[PDB]
């Protein structure tokens, strides 16, 4: 129950303001950045700032503090998911989100912040449905805003009827400093690109372990879905009954399902390293990179980052495969190898200098974090199986799919 949805600058003046209830006075926005500094410098950097009986919830985009005030007992995750959905809607309109937009596209953004919320309540937050009655180029509102099926306005027609599925692996990993796996989980996300005609219905075929166990085919290759969180479009009770993903799809880009399993198959890229940190002289990185997966796939454009001392100097990089640039902006090396086959080992040996006079504060030990990406390969073993198009017309659509293996936060610890 926000009382004023704010967008501030990085200083503390108002880019755009939109109050609803009168519970928070408009003068109360002026205290936000001093409270931010006075709570940030003492370890209490919290998303819920406090000013007497007036609270401050906020998220931080690149140049923007989407501040959301409240005075009573606000439902908090409501307001934060409201603010992230406002961020995603504005990124659907304005492909970048800066101060150049807000102080100049203020014709339409006040109307958006009138539409999204009344008396503190998020009510109509789909981007595509908000497009067809809020334009920057007005009729009656579409009934899709009022209708139960609220993410697909009827009357959409394309000449062909293409549906593109993108299955994205994102391996999260955190290997400890001894050489063992702490956590090998996989956050997978199926992102679909749907161009269909009318009001269709799709039923997705997965090789689920649970659906095969309800059928009687849990002895072939299947995926153990430890948890799945679907989009709003999937009728969840039909999934609760017999693992059935029934949904009226949206138009264009959307995220279908956000699953999260565990997998005790080996890590994809192994990073053994040593650090001979001689004091006040130099440092050595005899790091090796082997791949545990099969010898058929190729890892595109990997970026094996290794954090270095903050004030090192005169780098040398004797490699065998792949370029190095030393990036002192974040004080990191970026060991990049473009074409990376499976099962091979590429060795790299760096060598720096280090200052004589020691620093005032210590530097911290950030982790190695690689940025690999592999197509046509899944570590999970998940395969999509079927996708039925249901339509009163009845036609031949073309469901296309590809398999992407990426990283999530693929960190490996250092010494």
């Amino acid at each position: 129950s926000a009382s004023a949805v704010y967008v501030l600058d990085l200083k503390g003046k108002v880019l755009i303001c939109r109050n609803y209830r009168g519970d928070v006075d408009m003068s109360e926005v002026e205290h936000f950045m001093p409270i931010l500094m006075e709570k940030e410098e003492e370890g209490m950097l919290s998303p819920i700032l406090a000013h007497g009986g007036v609270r401050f919830m906020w998220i931080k985009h690149n140049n923007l503090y989407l501040v959301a005030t409240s005075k009573k007992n606000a439902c908090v995750s409501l307001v934060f998911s409201f603010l992230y959905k406002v961020v995603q809607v504005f990124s659907e309109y304005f492909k970048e989100l800066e101060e150049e937009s807000i102080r100049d596209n203020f014709v339409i953004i006040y109307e958006l912040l009138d539409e999204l919320m009344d008396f503190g309540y998020p009510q109509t937050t789909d981007s595509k449905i908000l497009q067809e009655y809020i334009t920057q180029e007005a009729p009656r509102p579409p009934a899709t805003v009022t209708n139960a099926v609220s993410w697909r306005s009827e009357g959409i027609k394309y000449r062909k009827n293409e549906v593109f599925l993108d299955v994205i692996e994102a391996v999260n990993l955190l290997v400890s400093a001894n050489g063992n796996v702490l956590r090998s989980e996989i956050v997978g996300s199926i992102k679909m690109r749907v161009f269909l005609s009318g009001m269709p219905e799709l039923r997705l075929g997965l090789n689920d372990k649970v659906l095969f166990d309800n059928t009687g085919r849990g002895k072939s290759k299947s995926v153990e879905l430890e948890d799945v969180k679907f989009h709003q479009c999937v009728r969840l009770s039909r999934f609760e009954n017999d693992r059935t993903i029934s949904f009226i799809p949206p138009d264009g880009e959307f995220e279908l399902m956000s699953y999260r399993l565990n997998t005790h198959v080996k890590p994809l890229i192994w990073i053994e390293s040593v650090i001979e940190k001689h004091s006040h002289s130099r440092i050595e990185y005899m790091v090796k990179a082997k791949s545990q997966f099969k010898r058929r796939s190729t890892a595109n454009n990997v970026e094996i980052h290794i954090p270095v001392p903050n004030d090192a100097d005169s780098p040398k990089f004797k490699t065998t495969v792949g370029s190095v640039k030393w990036v002192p902006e974040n004080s990191e090396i970026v060991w990049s190898v473009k074409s990376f086959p499976g099962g091979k080992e590429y060795l790299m040996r760096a060598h720096f200098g280090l200052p004589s006079v020691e620093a005032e504060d210590k530097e911290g030990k950030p982790p190695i974090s690689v940025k690999f990406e592999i197509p046509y390969f899944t570590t999970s073993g998940i395969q999509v199986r079927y996708l039925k198009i249901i339509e009163k017309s009845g036609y031949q659509a073309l469901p296309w799919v590809r398999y992407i293996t990426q990283n999530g936060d693929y960190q490996l610890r250092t010494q």
């Binding site: 593109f164 599925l165 075929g205 197509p375 046509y376 999509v384 199986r385 079927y386 996708l387 039925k388 198009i389 031949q396 659509a397 073309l398 469901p399 296309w400 799919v401 590809r402 992407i404």
Partner: peptide
């Protein structure tokens, strides 16, 4: 989209 697609079966009854 330089990674090229593959076609899945539609019905799989």
């Amino acid at each position: 989209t330089s990674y090229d697609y593959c076609r899945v079966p539609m019905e799989d009854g």
